[PDB]
Design a binder for this molecule. Structure first.
Ligand SMILES: *[C@@H]1O[C@H](CO)[C@@H](O[C@@H]2O[C@H](CO)[C@@H](O[C@@H]3O[C@H](CO[C@H]4O[C@H](CO)[C@@H](O)[C@H](O)[C@@H]4O)[C@@H](O)[C@H](O[C@H]4O[C@H](CO)[C@@H](O)[C@H](O)[C@@H]4O)[C@@H]3O)[C@H](O)[C@H]2NC(C)=O)[C@H](O)[C@H]1NC(C)=O
Lengths: 50, 43
């Protein structure tokens, strides 16, 4: 939305009331831990491929 | 005699253009299996 602050060199704007806002912030920390095997993934139950 | 006796002879011609007998099924032991051309290794 277009706004225009009414600026002049003798006028100020002071709040007379307030509000208390509780906002939410979501942050990732860790991810899934995985582990791999060579022979079970690549060949798998194969002696000559191992 | 033997050389003059009639003999029943079967002549079997083979056309070389194209099987194995199935073995016992083994469970709970890791074997290399053939199943109708599907080859693998497992329990
Ligand atoms: C500074 O700002 C604060 C809050 O922003 C004001 O303080 C009080 O605010 C409350 C809430 O507005 C006033 O209480 C009553 O609000 C009712 C509306 O309730 C709805 O909205 C609130 C959230 O604002 C929801 O929680 C609620 O579930 C509803 O959805 C009005 O209907 C009430 O009006 C009734 O009472 C007045 C007398 O107070 C009668 O004159 C009316 O006819 C009607 O019967 C009421 O307004 C509470 O009144 C505010 N306090 C005061 C002292 O006014 C401050 O007023 C404000 N300014 C300053 C200078 O601090």
């Amino acid at each position: 939305a277009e706004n225009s602050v009414a600026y002049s060199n003798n006028s100020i704007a002071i709040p007379t009331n307030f509000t208390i806002s509780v906002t939410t912030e979501i942050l990732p920390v860790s991810m899934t831990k995985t582990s791999v095997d060579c022979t079970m993934y690549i060949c798998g139950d194969s002696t000559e491929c191992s | 005699g033997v050389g003059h006796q009639p003999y029943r002879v079967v002549v079997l011609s083979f056309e070389l253009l194209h099987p194995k007998k199935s073995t016992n099924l083994v469970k709970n032991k890791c074997v290399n299996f053939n199943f109708n051309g599907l080859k693998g290794t497992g329990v």
